[PDB]
Each structure stands twice: as C-alpha cells, then as structure tokens.
Amino acid sequence: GAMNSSNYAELFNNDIKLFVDDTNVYRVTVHKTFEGNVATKAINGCIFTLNPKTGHLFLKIIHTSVWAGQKRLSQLAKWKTAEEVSALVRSLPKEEQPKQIIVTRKAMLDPLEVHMLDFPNIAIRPTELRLPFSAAMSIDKLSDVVMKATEPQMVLFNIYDDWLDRISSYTAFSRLTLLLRALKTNEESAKMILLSDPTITIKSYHLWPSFTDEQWITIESQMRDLILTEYGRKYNV
Amino acid sequence: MNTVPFTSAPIEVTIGIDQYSFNVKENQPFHGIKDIPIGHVHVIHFQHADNSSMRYGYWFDCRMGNFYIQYDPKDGLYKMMEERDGAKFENIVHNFKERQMMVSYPKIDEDDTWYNLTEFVQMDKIRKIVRKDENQFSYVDSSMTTVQENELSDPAHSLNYTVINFKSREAIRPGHEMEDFLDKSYYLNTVMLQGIFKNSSNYFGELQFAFLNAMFFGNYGSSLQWHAMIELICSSATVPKHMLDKLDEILYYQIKTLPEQYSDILLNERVWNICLYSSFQKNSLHNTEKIMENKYPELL
Numbered sequence A: 001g002a003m004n005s006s007n008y009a010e011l012f013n014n015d016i017k018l019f020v021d022d023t024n025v026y027r028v029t030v031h032k033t034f035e036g037n038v039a040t041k042a043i044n045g046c047i048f049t050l051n052p053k054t055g056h057l058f059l060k061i062i063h064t065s066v067w068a069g070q071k072r073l074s075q076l077a078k079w080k081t082a083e084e085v086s087a088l089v090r091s092l093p094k095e096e097q098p099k100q101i102i103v104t105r106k107a108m109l110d111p112l113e114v115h116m117l118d119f120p121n122i123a124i125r126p127t128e129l130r131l132p133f134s135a136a137m138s139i140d141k142l143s144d145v146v147m148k149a150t151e152p153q154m155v156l157f158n159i160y161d162d163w164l165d166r167i168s169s170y171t172a173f174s175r176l177t178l179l180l181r182a183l184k185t186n187e188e189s190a191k192m193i194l195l196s197d198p199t200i201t202i203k204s205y206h207l208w209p210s211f212t213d214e215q216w217i218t219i220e221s222q223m224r225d226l227i228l229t230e231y232g233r234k235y236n237v
Numbered sequence B: 001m002n003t004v005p006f007t008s009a010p011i012e013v014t015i016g017i018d019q020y021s022f023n024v025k026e027n028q029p030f031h032g033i034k035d036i037p038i039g040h041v042h043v044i045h046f047q048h049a050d051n052s053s054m055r056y057g058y059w060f061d062c063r064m065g066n067f068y069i070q071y072d073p074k075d076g077l078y079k080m081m082e083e084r085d086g087a088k089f090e091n092i093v094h095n096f097k098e099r100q101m102m103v104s105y106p107k108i109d110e111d112d113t114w115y116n117l118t119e120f121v122q123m124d125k126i127r128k129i130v131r132k133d134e135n136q137f138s139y140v141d142s143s144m145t146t147v148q149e150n151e152l153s154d155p156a157h158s159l160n161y162t163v164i165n166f167k168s169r170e171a172i173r174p175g176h177e178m179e180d181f182l183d184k185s186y187y188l189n190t191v192m193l194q195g196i197f198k199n200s201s202n203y204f205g206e207l208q209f210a211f212l213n214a215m216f217f218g219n220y221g222s223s224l225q226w227h228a229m230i231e232l233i234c235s236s237a238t239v240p241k242h243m244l245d246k247l248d249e250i251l252y253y254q255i256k257t258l259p260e261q262y263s264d265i266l267l268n269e270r271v272w273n274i275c276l277y278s279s280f281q282k283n284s285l286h287n288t289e290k291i292m293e294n295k296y297p298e299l300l
C-alpha cells in the first residue's frame, strides 16, 4: 500500500527498493514571443531514482531533444520516466532488481505499472510523504551534469557520500531529507549554511562538504532552524 | 407463441419473465406462462417472498426444446427441466390453457424493448459463458462469480465472460505502452474483435447478456463486465462508425429499462463520466448522453 510516517523503517530493511521522483524530468522557462504571446523553452531534466538504503542514485539525464515534435509533454514526461526506470531495471542483474518501486507522485503509478507489466513480482507503491527530492537540482554537482549534457546520459552517484561509514541508512536518509527540505524552502540560506566556513571543502568524488560528526550536528541544527523560521513567515505563526 | 408450463407453485414467489413480473401466493393454482414470443432468448427469474436472497433464473430459447418449471422441495427452488415427450407436453399445455391457469406474456404490440435489449444475445453464446452442457437452458443467480473475479473458487458455477484487463500483456504491445494504454484501439480491434469475438455482434451479445444478468440478478461481476466492455470502446480512438451507432442504441435501451432506484449500485460514476465527457467517444453517444442527463443527472 501507500508509504507513510507509520511504515518508514521499511525503507532501511534488506528488501531492495527504489524511490522514483519525476518532478525534474520536464523543465521549462516561460517567456514572451515577439507578438507578445507566451511560449515555453524546455531545459535539460533528470529522473531521480534513489536506493534509500545504499544511497545509490541513478540520475537519468533527460536531454531537451526527447521533447522535439512531441505533444502533451507533461503527460509524455510520466511515460518517458516509466520507460527509463523500466530500462534501468532490465539493465540490472536479477539479484540487484528492486522488489518495490515507490513513486513520489501518484500520477506515475499507471505509467510505471504498464511499463513493468512483465515484472508482476515488483510492487509499484505510492507514498503519503511529501519528500523534497524536487530540490535535487539545488545540489551543484547534479545541476552541473544535467545542464552540460549534450545527449541522453545515465550518471551514477552516492547521494550519502561516505556517511554510511559512520551512520545508519535511517540517519543518512534523515540528514538527506533535512538538507533537501532546507534547500527547497530557502535555497540561498541553505547554501550559505553549507559553504560558509571555507576550510570545509567538498571532495572531488562527493556532493556535500566533509563535515566532522560535531560539525554535522551544528549544520543539522542550522537547517532545522531555517525550516521553522520560513514556516513562521509562510503562515504568519 | 410458446408456453412454459409450471407443475405447481408451492411457495410464494415473485416470477419474472423478461422485463415483466407477477406475484404468486403459496399453493396458488398457477400453471405457467403462455404467448411467449418466438425469435428471442428469454429469462424466467424468481425471488422467494420469504428469502429475497433467492434471486435466480433460467435463460432459454423455446426453439431449442419444450421447457417447464417444477418446484424442488429438497433444493428449495423452482427448477427448469426439458420434456422430451412432445405429446405429453402439448397435452399438459392444452389442459392448463383450457383451465386458463396460465398468465399471458404481457407484450404491447408497439413495444420493441426486449428485442432492443437482446438484439445480439444468442442461446449458443450464453451456454459458452454459463457451462452446463447437459441442459439446453442456463441457470444464473445473484451470487455467481466470474472467471476474472475468481483469479483475484468453484469453476463449475462461474460466468465465463471474456477477461478484459486494461493493465495486462494482452492489452498492451511491448514498445507501445503509452500509446496502447491511452488509445485502446489495438486491444478492441485486433485482440478482442478480430482475435476473440470474431465480430461486433458477438461482442455486443456478451455486453447485453452481462447487462441483463446485472439488472435481473444484481450480479456484481456481470456489472463489472458490462462497464469494462463499454469502457474499452469509449477508450478507443478508432472504432467502426456502425459500432458507435449501434452501441448508442444498445446503451439507450439499457439506461431506459434500468429501475430508477438501482442506478446508484448498477451504474459506475467513473466509467459513465469518462465515456460521456472525457473519452474519444464523448460526442458519439448522443441518445445515451441525452437519456443519462435527463434520467440520472445526479450520477454525472
């Protein structure tokens, strides 16, 4: 059934599962034409496919060429997402294929269900969580590889860097969701918090700064404060 | 004009014949139904006064044999049986008519309702959906499950409707996932019409039989089958114009005949709203859309 606050620990068990977020697949700028009409211009997008236990991120880059001469692009985007997740699964050895795929948006259920018809043993699940994976394009290195892409490309990352050496998957996911929530609510403030102290760098092979255990606690506190402040302003509470 | 005699009516029962019904009292001298139009299938159906859970009946065609009803006090139901002795049967029928113990099939000359509901229904196809080859007539009741319902327990007593599943290998060509799911023309025209039904008459005959089983017996799986067969046409961009015109007529008479008080359990909001307002065929069911808007504006 639906993934929710109650059944949260299931993410961190030994059943392989993937989250699929399609928010950043079809991305546009809205602009005026010469005649004063409005037009969209597509920009490169990505499928965010994440193993929440391992941190393995399958970033499928969606090049604007995909949309050329197609109609109803917001609908096609859901099917293109399902097609690419389907191709990813079939590329993985049997023992690495997921037992569940959890979609962050219910509109992805039917497309993925039809694309995975011949995988009757893979459960396609919605979630009641409002996960902040839309904010993935606020991670500089992920934004950089999407916007530089000249063709369809799959890039593999570990979104937890080396955290699993020191913390559990549960803790790593909670830190990831806190960072992304902060980046979604106030990108400028979140980024200032992460990159202020210039002596803490991002390793070439990492996405996030090389914080010590104590420094992560300070960062996490600063992210939580940021999120509640913006909640205050938002609701005049 | 044919006759279905009854041995007797030992238990109080509401008897249906097609869209007509009459109440018979316990041990009322009732010996059957005469003046039944030749040329159509018919359904005789029963609801006991004591137990309205006993909703059950028999599809038959008078051209296939001499059929009568007899109450079985062991199994506690009115059973259909065939009389192979033509002379004993003519004899019995003549005597009950002479004694005027039979009700007349109460058809109005102008009234084409039953023809319109059964246009494509044929006894040979009914007997493939309801499997009991020793009898020429087919028993259906409220509780019987469909083969599809049984996949998601007794196969002898099931309704063998053609399985329709929009999210299945049969429905979707590999590489045409989005195309085939949003436009079901492939599934309708190649898989179902050309592959399984062979023609639109067989397809319509199953759709009409499913409807009638839903209406007369409140058979839930039949209702599912009726909606699925409608939805598969409405969800197809490419449907022969003669099929659209005939479907409009079929559905018009079904909606006209449906008892007003049953529209809430017998009509699926989603399918009808999608067929009349969202689907490729939203503008192709003029008669159906007008009667639905005038008779069930609430559902929509």
Ligand SMILES: CNCc1ccc(O)cc1
Pocket (backbone or CB within 6 Å): A086, A114, A115, A116, A117, A118, B168, B169, B170, B172, B173, B174, B175, B177
């Ligand atoms: C290959 N995508 C799923 C699928 C869809 C339909 C089909 O007959 C087999 C597999």
